């Protein structure tokens, strides 16, 4: 009816964010495993986000997709807000990407279809701008890809390197430039993901925030040799200063290179 903390057993922290942690967890009776997002709400006050969080769990509770991480429920005690989340066993595509250093065209094209389907679902539900950079993407039961998004950025301990430092790389020129953004932002993201999948780094990566901005806004990015032309064409068509010049989502799914190497 309404949950509370003691309905759950708590395991390790999966990741730690600035507003709180995602703990591995299971409902007490069913012994069923899930993820508990814990938000401190004191850091929520300062940061000035409560309200929109509170209609978030409204909007996200309504969403259902294979490739979207499902929000089971939510509750609060006094000092903390809890998101009851679908558990994704295999973690972040960002770790996986760190493993192999790069993906191949199967992996990529399939992830991309998986992503395109979610966003396309998302739009129909009137939900835009989902942050799909790799560290908010999780890996489900066997191979499947899940957009986590929602709550604010969580890291499993690792690396350090790029902390962020990972920010604008995925941000579209219109967003960076402080301008009204529409559904088409998410296709910019897609273009950046795809590139990173194959290359191992994002196209605009640079040692300074300024320079990164320089490259994004001016859309300056160059492929290493191995990138297939069909890859290039999709990326190129995906990353355009003009939103209107970028494909609709099904165009992506229909793309020659997508359909070729996509397991899905
Ligand atoms: O540490 C690992 O190997 C690891 C990280 C995440 C895992 N699964 C999972 N499921 C549901 C939500 C969620 N939040 C989250 C946790 C850390 C980073 C990013 C996100 Cl979205 N994470 C499993 C293992």
88 CA to centre of ligand 1 in angstroms? 7
Please give the annotated binding residues for ATP, written as ranges: 18, 37, 86-88, 135-136, 149
Order of strands across the sheet with 8-17?
71-76, 81-85, 33-39, 20-27, 8-17, 154-155
Contact criterion met (CB below 8 Å) for 33 and 24: yes
Considering the domain architecture, whether residues 15 and 141 belong to the same structural domain is answered as: no
112 CA to centre of ligand 1 in angstroms? 20
What is the C-alpha separation between 143 and 29, in angstroms, rounded?
29
CB neighbours of residue 225 within 10 Å? 4
Considering the domain architecture, whether residues 83 and 117 belong to the same structural domain is answered as: no
Considering the domain architecture, whether residues 83 and 160 belong to the same structural domain is answered as: no
Using most ligand atoms within 8 A of CB, pick from 36, 92, 98 the residue to mutate for ligand 1.
Answer: 92
Of 38, 61, 91, the one marking the end of a domain is 91
The sign one gets for the Cα dihedral 158, 39, 93, 200 is negative
Q: At a CB cut-off of 8 Å and minimum separation 6, what does 79 contact?
A: 40, 41, 42
**Total count of domains within the chain:** 2
Radius of gyration (C-alpha) of the chain in whole angstroms: 19
Residue 45 tokens, joined? 């006050």
Nearest of 252, 4, 50 to residue 151 by alpha carbon: 50
- Domain span at residue 171 reads 92-264
Q: At a CB cut-off of 8 Å and minimum separation 6, what does 137 contact?
A: 92, 93, 94, 115, 145, 146, 147, 148
Collapsed DSSP state (helix, strand, coil) of residue 144: coil
Query: How many CA atoms lie within 13 Å of 34's alpha carbon, on the beta-carbon side?
Result: 25
**Which residues of 5-115 form beta strands (DSSP E)?**
8-17, 20-27, 33-39, 71-76, 81-85
Considering the domain architecture, whether residues 140 and 253 belong to the same structural domain is answered as: yes
Considering the domain architecture, whether residues 136 and 231 belong to the same structural domain is answered as: yes
Query: How many CA atoms lie within 13 Å of 197's alpha carbon, on the beta-carbon side?
Result: 24
Residue 68 tokens, joined? 């979207």
Experimental method: X-ray
With residues binned 3-state (H G I as helix, E B as strand, rest as coil), the percentages for the chain, rounded to 5, are: 40, 15, 45
In degrees and rounded to multiples of 5, residue 83 shows phi and psi of -105, 125
What residues does 123 pair with on adjacent strands? Answer: none
CB neighbours of residue 19 within 10 Å? 21
Considering the domain architecture, whether residues 44 and 103 belong to the same structural domain is answered as: no
Please report the DSSP string for 204-231 in residue order.
T--SSHHHHHHHHHTT-----TT--HHH
In degrees and rounded to multiples of 5, residue 88 shows phi and psi of -115, 105
What is the C-alpha separation between 175 and 213, in angstroms, rounded?
11
CB neighbours of residue 214 within 10 Å? 13
What is the C-alpha separation between 143 and 258, in angstroms, rounded?
18
Of 42, 60, 91, the one marking the end of a domain is 91
Considering the domain architecture, whether residues 245 and 187 belong to the same structural domain is answered as: yes
């Amino acid at each position: 009816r309404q949950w509370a903390l003691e309905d759950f057993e708590i395991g390790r922290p999966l990741g730690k964010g600035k507003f709180g942690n995602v703990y591995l967890a299971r409902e007490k009776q069913s012994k069923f495993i899930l993820a508990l997002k814990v938000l401190f709400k004191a850091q929520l006050e300062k940061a000035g986000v409560e309200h929109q969080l509170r209609r978030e769990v409204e909007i996200q509770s309504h969403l259902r997709h294979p490739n979207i991480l499902r929000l089971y429920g939510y509750f609060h005690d006094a000092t903390r807000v809890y998101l009851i989340l679908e558990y994704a066993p295999l973690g972040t595509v960002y770790r996986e990407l760190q493993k192999l250093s790069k993906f191949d065209e199967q992996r990529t094209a399939t992830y991309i279809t998986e992503l395109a389907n979610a966003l396309s679902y998302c739009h129909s539900k009137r939900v835009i701008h989902r942050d799909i950079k790799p560290e908010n993407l999780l890996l489900g039961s066997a191979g499947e890809l899940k957009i986590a998004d929602f709550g604010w950025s969580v890291h499993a301990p690792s690396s350090r390197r790029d902390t962020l430092c990972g920010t604008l790389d995925y941000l579209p020129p219109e967003m960076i430039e402080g301008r009204m953004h529409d559904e088409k932002v998410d296709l910019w993201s897609l273009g950046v993901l795809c590139y990173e999948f194959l290359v191992g780094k994002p196209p605009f990566e640079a040692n300074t925030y300024q320079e990164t901005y320089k490259r994004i806004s001016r859309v300056e990015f160059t492929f290493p040799d191995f990138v297939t032309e069909g890859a290039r064409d999709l990326i190129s068509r995906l990353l355009k200063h003009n939103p209107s010049q970028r494909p609709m989502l099904r165009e992506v799914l229909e793309h020659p290179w997508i359909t070729a190497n996509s397991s899905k």
